[PDB]
Design a protein around this nucleic acid. Structure first.
Length: 194
DNA sequence: TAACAGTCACCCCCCAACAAC
DNA sequence: GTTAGTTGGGGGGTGACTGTTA
Protein backbone atom coordinates (compact mmCIF):
# COMPACT_ATOMS: atom_id res chain seq x y z
CA UNK A 1 0.00 0.00 0.00
CA UNK A 2 2.28 2.84 1.34
CA UNK A 3 5.48 0.81 0.66
CA UNK A 4 4.61 0.43 -3.06
CA UNK A 5 4.63 4.22 -3.74
CA UNK A 6 7.54 4.84 -1.32
CA UNK A 7 10.67 6.31 -3.07
CA UNK A 8 13.42 3.62 -3.35
CA UNK A 9 17.17 4.03 -2.70
CA UNK A 10 19.35 4.64 -5.76
CA UNK A 11 21.47 1.84 -7.14
CA UNK A 12 25.18 1.88 -6.21
CA UNK A 13 28.00 2.19 -8.82
CA UNK A 14 28.72 -1.41 -9.70
CA UNK A 15 25.02 -2.44 -9.83
CA UNK A 16 24.47 0.54 -12.27
CA UNK A 17 27.36 -0.80 -14.45
CA UNK A 18 26.02 -4.39 -14.16
CA UNK A 19 22.43 -3.35 -15.23
CA UNK A 20 23.78 -1.64 -18.37
CA UNK A 21 26.42 -4.41 -19.16
CA UNK A 22 24.22 -7.51 -18.74
CA UNK A 23 21.96 -6.85 -21.85
CA UNK A 24 25.14 -6.27 -23.93
CA UNK A 25 26.84 -9.54 -22.68
CA UNK A 26 23.46 -11.40 -23.05
CA UNK A 27 23.26 -10.20 -26.69
CA UNK A 28 26.75 -11.50 -27.49
CA UNK A 29 26.43 -14.76 -25.46
CA UNK A 30 22.72 -15.76 -25.64
CA UNK A 31 23.09 -19.35 -24.31
CA UNK A 32 25.50 -18.51 -21.42
CA UNK A 33 24.39 -18.66 -17.74
CA UNK A 34 23.75 -15.23 -16.13
CA UNK A 35 26.07 -16.23 -13.23
CA UNK A 36 28.89 -16.52 -15.70
CA UNK A 37 28.15 -13.20 -17.36
CA UNK A 38 28.04 -11.52 -13.92
CA UNK A 39 31.48 -13.03 -13.07
CA UNK A 40 32.92 -11.42 -16.33
CA UNK A 41 31.05 -8.13 -15.70
CA UNK A 42 32.59 -7.93 -12.17
CA UNK A 43 36.05 -8.61 -13.62
CA UNK A 44 35.45 -5.72 -16.13
CA UNK A 45 34.41 -3.47 -13.13
CA UNK A 46 37.61 -4.35 -11.21
CA UNK A 47 39.85 -3.61 -14.27
CA UNK A 48 38.00 -0.34 -15.01
CA UNK A 49 40.18 2.80 -14.44
CA UNK A 50 39.28 4.80 -11.28
CA UNK A 51 38.48 7.83 -13.51
CA UNK A 52 35.68 5.70 -15.11
CA UNK A 53 34.41 4.36 -11.74
CA UNK A 54 34.33 8.04 -10.50
CA UNK A 55 31.79 8.82 -13.30
CA UNK A 56 29.44 6.21 -11.79
CA UNK A 57 30.18 7.28 -8.14
CA UNK A 58 29.47 10.98 -8.92
CA UNK A 59 26.04 10.06 -10.44
CA UNK A 60 25.31 7.93 -7.36
CA UNK A 61 26.18 10.85 -4.98
CA UNK A 62 23.84 13.10 -7.03
CA UNK A 63 21.04 10.41 -7.10
CA UNK A 64 21.43 10.07 -3.29
CA UNK A 65 20.57 13.81 -2.92
CA UNK A 66 17.40 13.25 -5.06
CA UNK A 67 16.59 10.31 -2.75
CA UNK A 68 16.89 12.36 0.47
CA UNK A 69 14.50 14.89 -1.08
CA UNK A 70 11.95 12.32 -2.25
CA UNK A 71 12.00 10.36 1.06
CA UNK A 72 11.63 13.56 3.21
CA UNK A 73 8.77 14.84 1.01
CA UNK A 74 7.03 11.40 1.15
CA UNK A 75 7.36 10.79 4.95
CA UNK A 76 6.24 14.40 5.79
CA UNK A 77 2.92 13.99 3.92
CA UNK A 78 2.16 10.74 5.86
CA UNK A 79 -0.38 10.53 8.72
CA UNK A 80 0.61 8.40 11.81
CA UNK A 81 -1.75 5.67 10.44
CA UNK A 82 0.18 5.67 7.10
CA UNK A 83 3.67 5.62 8.81
CA UNK A 84 2.42 2.76 10.97
CA UNK A 85 1.06 0.81 7.96
CA UNK A 86 4.48 1.51 6.19
CA UNK A 87 6.44 0.12 9.19
CA UNK A 88 4.15 -3.02 9.33
CA UNK A 89 4.67 -3.72 5.55
CA UNK A 90 8.47 -3.41 5.98
CA UNK A 91 8.28 -5.76 9.05
CA UNK A 92 6.11 -8.31 7.12
CA UNK A 93 8.43 -8.27 4.08
CA UNK A 94 11.46 -8.74 6.39
CA UNK A 95 9.78 -11.65 8.29
CA UNK A 96 8.76 -13.43 5.06
CA UNK A 97 12.36 -13.20 3.64
CA UNK A 98 13.89 -14.38 6.94
CA UNK A 99 11.46 -17.37 7.01
CA UNK A 100 12.20 -18.33 3.34
CA UNK A 101 15.98 -18.11 3.98
CA UNK A 102 15.56 -20.46 7.04
CA UNK A 103 13.45 -22.95 4.96
CA UNK A 104 16.01 -23.05 2.05
CA UNK A 105 18.82 -23.77 4.56
CA UNK A 106 16.77 -26.71 6.06
CA UNK A 107 16.26 -28.15 2.50
CA UNK A 108 20.02 -27.66 1.77
CA UNK A 109 20.76 -29.49 5.14
CA UNK A 110 18.49 -32.43 4.17
CA UNK A 111 15.99 -32.07 6.99
CA UNK A 112 13.45 -35.00 7.15
CA UNK A 113 9.85 -34.12 6.26
CA UNK A 114 7.29 -34.13 9.08
CA UNK A 115 5.08 -37.28 9.45
CA UNK A 116 2.32 -37.82 6.89
CA UNK A 117 -1.19 -38.22 8.43
CA UNK A 118 -3.70 -40.85 7.28
CA UNK A 119 -5.48 -37.91 5.55
CA UNK A 120 -2.27 -36.81 3.69
CA UNK A 121 -2.01 -40.53 2.57
CA UNK A 122 -5.58 -40.45 1.24
CA UNK A 123 -5.03 -37.07 -0.68
CA UNK A 124 -1.89 -38.66 -2.30
CA UNK A 125 -3.84 -41.72 -3.46
CA UNK A 126 -7.22 -40.15 -4.25
CA UNK A 127 -6.35 -36.70 -5.81
CA UNK A 128 -5.64 -37.77 -9.46
CA UNK A 129 -9.10 -39.33 -10.00
CA UNK A 130 -11.10 -36.98 -7.75
CA UNK A 131 -13.89 -35.16 -9.67
CA UNK A 132 -13.14 -31.46 -10.37
CA UNK A 133 -11.49 -29.33 -12.98
CA UNK A 134 -9.10 -27.21 -10.95
CA UNK A 135 -6.91 -28.53 -8.01
CA UNK A 136 -9.06 -26.53 -5.50
CA UNK A 137 -12.28 -28.27 -6.65
CA UNK A 138 -10.52 -31.73 -6.65
CA UNK A 139 -9.37 -31.12 -3.02
CA UNK A 140 -13.00 -30.32 -2.01
CA UNK A 141 -13.99 -33.68 -3.53
CA UNK A 142 -11.19 -35.63 -1.78
CA UNK A 143 -12.06 -34.04 1.69
CA UNK A 144 -15.71 -35.10 1.26
CA UNK A 145 -14.75 -38.63 0.21
CA UNK A 146 -12.47 -38.81 3.33
CA UNK A 147 -15.46 -37.79 5.48
CA UNK A 148 -17.45 -40.85 4.11
CA UNK A 149 -14.86 -43.60 4.48
CA UNK A 150 -15.78 -46.79 6.35
CA UNK A 151 -13.59 -47.94 9.26
CA UNK A 152 -12.39 -50.80 6.97
CA UNK A 153 -11.06 -48.35 4.36
CA UNK A 154 -9.77 -45.73 6.84
CA UNK A 155 -7.63 -48.52 8.48
CA UNK A 156 -5.31 -48.74 5.45
CA UNK A 157 -4.53 -44.95 5.69
CA UNK A 158 -4.12 -45.20 9.50
CA UNK A 159 -1.60 -48.08 8.96
CA UNK A 160 0.38 -46.15 6.27
CA UNK A 161 0.57 -43.16 8.79
CA UNK A 162 1.78 -45.49 11.60
CA UNK A 163 4.71 -46.61 9.37
CA UNK A 164 5.53 -42.97 8.46
CA UNK A 165 5.66 -41.92 12.13
CA UNK A 166 8.36 -44.66 12.53
CA UNK A 167 10.26 -43.45 9.48
CA UNK A 168 10.01 -39.85 10.84
CA UNK A 169 11.33 -40.95 14.29
CA UNK A 170 14.30 -42.86 12.75
CA UNK A 171 15.23 -40.12 10.17
CA UNK A 172 15.05 -37.33 12.83
CA UNK A 173 17.23 -39.23 15.37
CA UNK A 174 19.98 -39.51 12.77
CA UNK A 175 19.55 -35.98 11.26
CA UNK A 176 19.65 -34.39 14.69
CA UNK A 177 22.78 -36.40 15.62
CA UNK A 178 24.34 -35.17 12.33
CA UNK A 179 23.32 -31.53 13.06
CA UNK A 180 25.19 -31.77 16.43
CA UNK A 181 28.34 -33.14 14.60
CA UNK A 182 28.28 -30.17 12.21
CA UNK A 183 27.84 -27.74 15.14
CA UNK A 184 24.15 -26.83 14.48
CA UNK A 185 22.52 -27.55 17.88
CA UNK A 186 20.18 -24.56 17.15
CA UNK A 187 18.34 -26.75 14.58
CA UNK A 188 17.34 -29.38 17.12
CA UNK A 189 13.82 -29.67 18.69
CA UNK A 190 13.26 -28.26 22.23
CA UNK A 191 10.34 -30.81 22.67
CA UNK A 192 9.72 -34.35 21.21
CA UNK A 193 6.25 -36.13 21.31
CA UNK A 194 6.22 -39.66 22.98
C1' DT B 1 21.49 -5.43 4.12
C1' DA B 2 19.55 -5.12 -0.15
C1' DA B 3 19.80 -2.38 -4.06
C1' DC B 4 20.46 -4.44 -10.34
C1' DA B 5 19.25 -9.14 -13.41
C1' DG B 6 18.38 -14.21 -15.77
C1' DT B 7 17.84 -18.88 -14.58
C1' DC B 8 17.16 -22.60 -11.54
C1' DA B 9 14.76 -24.91 -8.30
C1' DC B 10 12.13 -24.43 -4.91
C1' DC B 11 8.60 -21.52 -1.70
C1' DC B 12 3.97 -19.66 -0.24
C1' DC B 13 -0.92 -19.40 -0.75
C1' DC B 14 -5.18 -20.88 -2.11
C1' DC B 15 -8.76 -24.83 -1.50
C1' DA B 16 -8.92 -28.87 3.29
C1' DA B 17 -7.73 -31.74 7.24
C1' DC B 18 -4.71 -33.09 10.54
C1' DA B 19 4.05 -32.17 15.99
C1' DA B 20 6.35 -28.57 17.75
C1' DC B 21 6.40 -24.17 19.60
C1' DG C 1 -3.86 -22.21 21.62
C1' DT C 2 -1.37 -21.20 17.77
C1' DT C 3 1.76 -22.05 13.96
C1' DA C 4 3.85 -24.57 10.60
C1' DG C 5 4.30 -28.37 7.48
C1' DT C 6 2.48 -31.98 5.23
C1' DT C 7 -0.60 -34.74 0.80
C1' DG C 8 -2.25 -32.35 -4.56
C1' DG C 9 -1.47 -28.74 -8.61
C1' DG C 10 -1.19 -24.17 -10.29
C1' DG C 11 -0.77 -19.14 -9.86
C1' DG C 12 2.37 -15.80 -8.46
C1' DG C 13 6.97 -15.01 -5.94
C1' DT C 14 11.92 -15.12 -4.45
C1' DG C 15 16.65 -16.79 -2.43
C1' DA C 16 21.04 -18.76 -4.32
C1' DC C 17 24.04 -18.08 -7.61
C1' DT C 18 27.45 -14.65 -9.92
C1' DG C 19 29.27 -9.88 -8.39
C1' DT C 20 30.20 -4.53 -5.39
C1' DT C 21 28.74 -0.78 -2.70
C1' DA C 22 27.11 2.36 0.89
Amino acid sequence: SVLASCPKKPVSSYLRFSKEQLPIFKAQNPDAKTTELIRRIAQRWRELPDSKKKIYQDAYRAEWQVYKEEISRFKEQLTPSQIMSLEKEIMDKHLKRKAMTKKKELTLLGKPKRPRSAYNVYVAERFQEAKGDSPQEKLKTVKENWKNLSDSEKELYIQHAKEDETRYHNEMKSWEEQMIEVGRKDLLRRTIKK
